[PDB]
RNA sequence: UGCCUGGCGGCCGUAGCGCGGUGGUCCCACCUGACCCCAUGCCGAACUCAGAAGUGAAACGCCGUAGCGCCGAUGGUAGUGUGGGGUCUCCCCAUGCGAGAGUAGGGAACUGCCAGGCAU
RNA sequence: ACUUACCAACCCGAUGCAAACUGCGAAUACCGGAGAAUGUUAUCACGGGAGACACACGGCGGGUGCUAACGUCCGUC
RNA sequence: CCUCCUAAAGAGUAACGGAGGAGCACGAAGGUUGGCUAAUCCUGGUCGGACAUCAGGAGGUUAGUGCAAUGGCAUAAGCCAGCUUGACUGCGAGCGUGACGGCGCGAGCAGGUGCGAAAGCAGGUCAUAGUGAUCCGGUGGUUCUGAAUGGAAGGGCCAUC
């Protein structure tokens, strides 16, 4: 609704990315979470990018 | 004219009026007017009968009304087809099973209570009987 | 809630999970004056091994019955008695008390003595 | 520490002989002293609550707890979770050090002081009283105080009755009427 | 305002009654809350569905101080 | 073997609540102290540690007590599957099932494992 | 602050009412196990060929309507 | 599309029958470890009142649950804090529910992770609404394909709009 789709991209260099939504008004800072990368088979840091 | 002050819901399913009455004993006064029939008493019928018996005892003694018209009755007006939602509430009835003590009285001699009840009974759509208080 | 009832409430979830897993549990009880330990079978109605400071044989070699040193003694005692009956794998039940101080001292002693948890 | 010693050596002695208790543990004890500042007007000016907190912290030597609104009420125009006051629970040394400072130097400095009420007991021994000016406490500086505030003082006791609760405070020579 | 609406029936209720032989994984009861609680060899799903954790016979029982309903699986 | 107490269960109000009485050697509790381990959106209240001057006041356990909860027949009543019938909005008969409420009455739990104190 | 031929929630005792109330609770029905007798497999699977998807009245249980309709809408025979 | 009743004590069951709600929210309002327990009434208390905050008693979940209803919820699913990313990737015994397309529940296995001393718990949120098939096209990745051959375009496959 007032909530936008965002992609979390792998820092491991692999093109792999997770997909989620974000309330861009209330939380303007880029989302950072450690998630499992199935290409490097390890838990790496993921950073927000535009969908 | 008796009626619930507020209700959980406006309208109610028709339902049925099977079974024998609960509250078949003179529990507050000395005499009672018991229903022998099965039917509905409208708030207007209840009031009409209450007025008749009150005038009869010349507003001496004490009267109890053991029935309450808590059932909403709907009705579709003229020139209205079937369906298009349930009708509007017009009046309130009390379901009456054989045995219900409708009215109770005390503070008046038996002969007078008998007459007052004879007068009220004529305003009711169901057959009644005079009842006296009992020891158990 | 009063101290006891509040403690039983705190203990209920873990005890129900242990019941569910059908685990042999090392149940610890603590009091200002004494510390107790029981190894109860999964059914919960029978004790396999026990040790405490109310026991003449243990209290004799201790300064005060209600301190961390006494707790470490009770801990060493249950594990030794449990291992003599072949009981090796257990699950610790802190019984509403914090896993700290006396309770911790008892559990670290039982772990040292050879009990597996 | 002074009045706790006075309790042990002289108050217990006085109460035991007054009510004829079978045990010393029956003797009413001062359980806790609770100081409270109902700000209320903090909803308009948020800074006002902070000054009430800094005032209470000087009176009783411990960090106050800023109490929030338990439920929303239209009458006072407050929503659930609003900082609408601050309290302090006094126990042990700090309760006694405060209780002496109250009887000895604070309560005598009340404007035209003749004696506090002895009928303000909750029916179960606990005593409730309210100060109008916070400048009665010598820990507060008249030159630095932004506004004149008041607070609630409640002495929670182990007394079962008001008769018992009265006797426990009177034995500390609490300035009554 | 106007009525006329209702949702699809969710087909909840008891799927396997007392005594029925079930293989591990079989749903015993689909429910909204925990009308029945998971007992021995019975798991509880995210939508409070009770399922078999082991092959055996479905057993219904009333246990505890709160007199609650429990579904368990007895070995056959 | 008996009495008392603590722990962990079975059972889940015939087991609970109230009222009266009662217990501290041991156990349990309150309790004493708090710098520290650890703790408080404040507070050693709680959590926690180091203890033993005091008390069974509270709590807790035990004993008593039908004010309340709770359990609860028998008989009748209500309903109802099948077959039949009437004056068919509602009933009745044959047969099988048979409540709920109320009544008499019951009732101040019962029980297992381990440990500790005391006594013979 | 004092007081009144008024009204009066809660609480206690007494008396009823409920599709969207339940500290109770059937008869039936339904699911599962075992067993006999009976029944031209009545059962299940796969494959060939369909028709049919305007129903009606009567009984029982209901909604709607006026417990109006040879009314209307479900269930079940 | 979701919830309750009608609905005849398994499921299902109609009407322009009776009542309401959804077309979102949340990086914490998710995970875990540790802790905590409401509503309402009576009594007392500076300003302060029927109702703000404080204390005691009764009460015992009637409160609360981001939102409708119903079922749940104290071992809390309710409320707080510390650390955190399991709002994991591949799979999946066995089930439920559908004419179908589908939709749902799921222990367990592998890799990797968070929390906890540990047993363990975590594949989002108490549960049940919060939604859009296919085609065509866009973006990123790719041991695939690549119309003489090597490339390339385009196509496929995985992710996503
Ligand atoms: Mg202490
Ligand atoms: Mg006592
Ligand atoms: Mg019988
Ligand atoms: Mg029965
Ligand atoms: Mg009965
Ligand atoms: Mg009864
Ligand atoms: Mg008796
Ligand atoms: Mg012994
Ligand atoms: Mg076929
Ligand atoms: Mg058609
Ligand atoms: Mg048709
Ligand atoms: Mg038809
Ligand atoms: Mg017709
Ligand atoms: Mg059904
Ligand atoms: Mg049915
Ligand atoms: Mg939540
Ligand atoms: Mg927890
Ligand atoms: Mg007040
Ligand atoms: Mg670890
Ligand atoms: Mg070419
Ligand atoms: Mg080529």
UniProtKB/Swiss-Prot annotation, chain B:
Describe its function: Binds directly to 23S ribosomal RNA and is located at the A site of the peptidyltransferase center. It contacts the A and P site tRNAs. One of the last ribosomal proteins to be assembled in the 50S subunit. The simultaneous presence of uL16 and bL36 probably triggers ObgE's GTPase activity and eventual dissociation from the mature 50S ribosmal subunit. It has an essential role in subunit assembly.
Q: How does it assemble?
A: Part of the 50S ribosomal subunit. Cross-links to the A and P site tRNAs. Interacts with assembly factor DarP(YjgA).
**GO terms under biological process:** cytoplasmic translation; ribosomal large subunit assembly
Which residues are recorded as modified ((3R)-3-hydroxyarginine)?
A: 81
Q: Which family does it belong to?
A: Belongs to the universal ribosomal protein uL16 family.
- A Pfam family cross-referenced in the UniProt record is Ribosomal_L16
Encoding gene per record: rplP
One GO cellular component term of this record is: cytosolic large ribosomal subunit
Processing after translation: Is hydroxylated on Arg-81 by RoxA. The modification is nearly suppressed when E.coli is grown in anoxia.
Organism name = Escherichia coli (strain K12)
**GO molecular-function terms, A-Z:** rRNA binding; structural constituent of ribosome; tRNA binding
Q: In the record, which residues are listed under signal peptide?
A: none
Query: What protein name does the entry list?
Result: Large ribosomal subunit protein uL16
Sites of N-methylmethionine modification = 1
Q: Mind listing the UniProt keywords for this protein, alphabetically?
A: Hydroxylation, Methylation, Ribonucleoprotein, Ribosomal protein, RNA-binding, rRNA-binding, tRNA-binding
From Swiss-Prot, chain C:
Q: How is it modified after translation?
A: The protein has been shown to contain a phosphoserine, which was required for the protein to bind to 5S rRNA. However, the presence of this phosphoserine is controversial, and it has not been seen by mass spectrometry.
Tell me one Pfam family matched here: Ribosomal_L18p
Q: Can you supply a Gene Ontology BP term from the record?
A: cytoplasmic translation
| Annotated GO MF terms | 5S rRNA binding; structural constituent of ribosome
Could you tell me which residues belong to the region Required for binding of the 5S rRNA/L5/L18 complex to the 23S rRNA?
A: 1-17
Q: Sorted alphabetically, which Gene3D superfamilies does this protein's record hold?
A: 3.30.420.100
Residue ranges crossing the lipid bilayer per the database entry: none
> Keywords on this record?
Phosphoprotein, Ribonucleoprotein, Ribosomal protein, RNA-binding, rRNA-binding
GO cellular component: a single term: cytoplasm
The written remark on domains in the entry is:
The basic N-terminus is not necessary for binding to 5S rRNA. It is however required for cooperative binding of L5 and L18 to 5S rRNA as well as for binding of the 5S rRNA/L5/L18 complex to the 23S rRNA.
Record text on subunit structure and interactions: Part of the 50S ribosomal subunit; part of the 5S rRNA/L5/L18/L25 subcomplex. Contacts the 5S and 23S rRNAs.
Q: Which NCBIfam families match?
A: L18_bact
Briefly state the protein's biological role: This is one of the proteins that mediates the attachment of the 5S rRNA subcomplex onto the large ribosomal subunit where it forms part of the central protuberance. Binds stably to 5S rRNA; increases binding abilities of L5 in a cooperative fashion; both proteins together confer 23S rRNA binding. The 5S rRNA and some of its associated proteins might help stabilize positioning of ribosome-bound tRNAs.
Q: Spell out the family assignment given in the record's similarity comment.
A: Belongs to the universal ribosomal protein uL18 family.
Q: What is this protein called?
A: Large ribosomal subunit protein uL18
Swiss-Prot record, chain D:
Please list the GO terms describing molecular function.
5S rRNA binding; RNA binding; structural constituent of ribosome; tRNA binding
One BP annotation, GO:
cytoplasmic translation
Per the UniProt record, one Pfam family is: Ribosomal_L5
User: What's the superkingdom here?
Assistant: Bacteria
> What are the record's GO terms for cellular component?
cytoplasm; cytosol; cytosolic large ribosomal subunit
Query: Keywords on this record?
Result: Acetylation, Ribonucleoprotein, Ribosomal protein, RNA-binding, rRNA-binding, tRNA-binding
What InterPro entries has UniProt attached to this entry? Ribosomal_uL5, Ribosomal_uL5_bac-type, Ribosomal_uL5_C, Ribosomal_uL5_CS, Ribosomal_uL5_dom_sf, Ribosomal_uL5_N
Residues modified to N6-acetyllysine:
2
Q: How does it assemble?
A: Part of the 50S ribosomal subunit; part of the 5S rRNA/L5/L18/L25 subcomplex. Contacts the 5S rRNA; cross-links to the P site tRNA. Forms a bridge to the 30S subunit in the 70S ribosome, contacting protein S13 and S19.
Q: Which family does it belong to?
A: Belongs to the universal ribosomal protein uL5 family.
Q: Other comments?
A: Identified as a multicopy suppressor of the slow growth phenotype of an rsgA (yjeQ) deletion mutant.
Give the protein's biological function: This is one of the proteins that bind and probably mediate the attachment of the 5S RNA into the large ribosomal subunit, where it forms part of the central protuberance. Its 5S rRNA binding is significantly enhanced in the presence of L18.
Could you identify this protein by its name?
Large ribosomal subunit protein uL5
Organism of origin is Escherichia coli (strain K12)
User: Which gene name does the record give?
Assistant: rplE
Curated annotation (Swiss-Prot), chain E:
Q: What PANTHER family does the entry give?
A: LARGE RIBOSOMAL SUBUNIT PROTEIN BL27M (PTHR15893:SF0), RIBOSOMAL PROTEIN L27 (PTHR15893)
In terms of Pfam families, this protein maps to: Ribosomal_L27
Does the keyword section mention Cell inner membrane? Answer: no
Instruction: State the family it belongs to.
Output: Belongs to the bacterial ribosomal protein bL27 family.
Which keywords belong to this entry?
Ribonucleoprotein, Ribosomal protein, RNA-binding, rRNA-binding, tRNA-binding
Q: Which Gene Ontology MF annotations are present?
A: ribosome binding; rRNA binding; structural constituent of ribosome; tRNA binding
Cellular component per GO, a single term: cytoplasm
GO BP:
assembly of large subunit precursor of preribosome; cytoplasmic translation; cytosolic ribosome assembly; positive regulation of ribosome biogenesis; regulation of cell growth; ribosomal large subunit assembly
Print the organism lineage.
Bacteria, Pseudomonadati, Pseudomonadota, Gammaproteobacteria, Enterobacterales
Indicate what this protein is called per its UniProt record: Large ribosomal subunit protein bL27
Q: Which InterPro entries match?
A: Ribosomal_bL27, Ribosomal_bL27_CS
